[PDB]
Write a protein that binds this ligand. Structure first.
Ligand code: BR
Ligand code: K
Ligand code: K
Ligand code: K
Ligand code: MN
Ligand code: MN
Ligand code: MN
Lengths: 252, 251
């Protein structure tokens, strides 16, 4: 009866999360059983719809990691249905202003703190009778920062009480800032932008996460003091594994 | 043409992928790599018929030959998969001549076999001239994974209508009384594997093998295996994730 990422935080440690773009329950469970604190299901840059995400949330919870979802859009009703289906973390794209951050916050809390609609099918089963007492704590919410405008409005975004923090998408930020969308970009303007966001978030007493294409990049970000680090998409890890298997098999 | 049969016709073996995770995106992604075929496992996986059908499309688009390892050597199940554009069949637990003939039956139209005619997806690939070339378009391998199959290898290899045999080394090791470890070094198992290969080659038939690693597969290819699989998606993904976590946590 605790959110595994909040459990990390409450002991002053970061969380490490997986990242799924392939639908299905078997790899979800299997990866959740690894040394991940959470597994994010990507519903934006994937073919995963609601019908496919629902059983995946169950698998992840059984494997023993906190089920997260990066949604397709910052839409309150979408987020509500996922929370009611047992998503216990939400990463919302394209949060560029304070109003949009407030929109995210509105979906995560019941009245009076937000406007979340009441019908917690799966959380009521996990947390039982004492759910509603602690409902806000059970969920982690992060606003994605991935545009020049978000960067400009970082302080007003972090002013919003009902979100835990922000989540950096480095590749989308590189592309928005006029650069190539490299995996794990180290383009200097982007490195500076990210460093800045991390500072402002910590200064405001908020959490800061970041998407990572690799183990090596995650290690750096963890060393830099990021609170929530994802590494690495299941599809990318599998393709690179298969390429290496083939190279080894066809070698002289 | 069937890409695996093309390999064989040009004197070279085939390397194949191996899928136990349902879905089309990784099926297409892995098919675009330097695999000649990708096998969809329908036995030791949650992949049902509804899930396999779009995956065969995805593999074909990516440009490998879609193969299936069926749940069972059942003719009507195989016929429905061929009709859905499985162009390779690996049937488990083929232990006798009789069972190998049952496999053959499913792969060829009368008078050579008793395949029912209704080739939804192959007729789209091959057009109106499909029937005259249908047998060629499909590859059929009988699995050798028991002591019984080992004993009856020559009688199994005698059957017209199958291209050869596919060794299931973990099941074979288990049935021989050893641990079901992939890419095993256990001497009795290694010897049985070499024996089946020798018998198949002497009978002018093809031999495949399931591999857990590229390093093992390189050896199998060097030994003359016609059809080498390496390595299951779930196994590879799991090892990749474990290494990423170790690298991130500086373990
Ligand atoms: Br394996
Ligand atoms: K659906
Ligand atoms: K875990
Ligand atoms: K290919
Ligand atoms: Mn984006
Ligand atoms: Mn087997
Ligand atoms: Mn078996």
């Amino acid at each position: 009866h605790h959110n595994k990422v909040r459990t990390c935080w409450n002991e002053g440690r970061p969380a490490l999360a997986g990242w799924l773009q392939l639908p299905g329950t078997l790899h979800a469970e299997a990866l959740a059983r690894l040394d991940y604190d959470a597994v994010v299901i990507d519903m934006q840059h994937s073919p995963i719809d609601f019908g496919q995400v629902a059983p995946m949330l169950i698998a992840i919870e059984l494997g023993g990691a906190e089920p997260f979802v990066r949604t397709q859009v910052n839409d309150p009703s979408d987020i509500m249905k996922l929370l009611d289906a047992g998503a216990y973390g939400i990463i919302a794209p394209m949060v560029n202003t304070r109003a949009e951050a407030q929109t995210l916050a509105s979906a995560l809390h019941y009245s009076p703190r937000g406007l979340r609609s009441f019908g917690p099918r799966r959380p009521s089963l996990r947390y039982g009778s004492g759910y509603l007492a602690q409902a806000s704590e059970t969920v982690v919410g992060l606003a994605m920062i991935e545009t020049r405008e978000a960067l400009a409005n970082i302080d007003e975004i972090l002013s919003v009480d009902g979100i835990d923090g922000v989540f950096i998408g480095p590749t989308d930020l590189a592309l928005d800032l006029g650069h190539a969308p490299l995996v794990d970009t180290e383009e200097a303007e982007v490195v500076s932008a990210i460093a800045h966001v991390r500072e402002r978030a910590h200064a405001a007493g908020k959490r800061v996460g970041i998407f990572c294409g690799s183990g090596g990049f995650a290690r750096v970000k963890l060393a830099e003091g990021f609170d929530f680090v994802t590494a690495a998409p299941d599809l990318a890890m599998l393709s690179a594994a298969a390429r290496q298997v083939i190279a080894d098999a066809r070698a002289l």
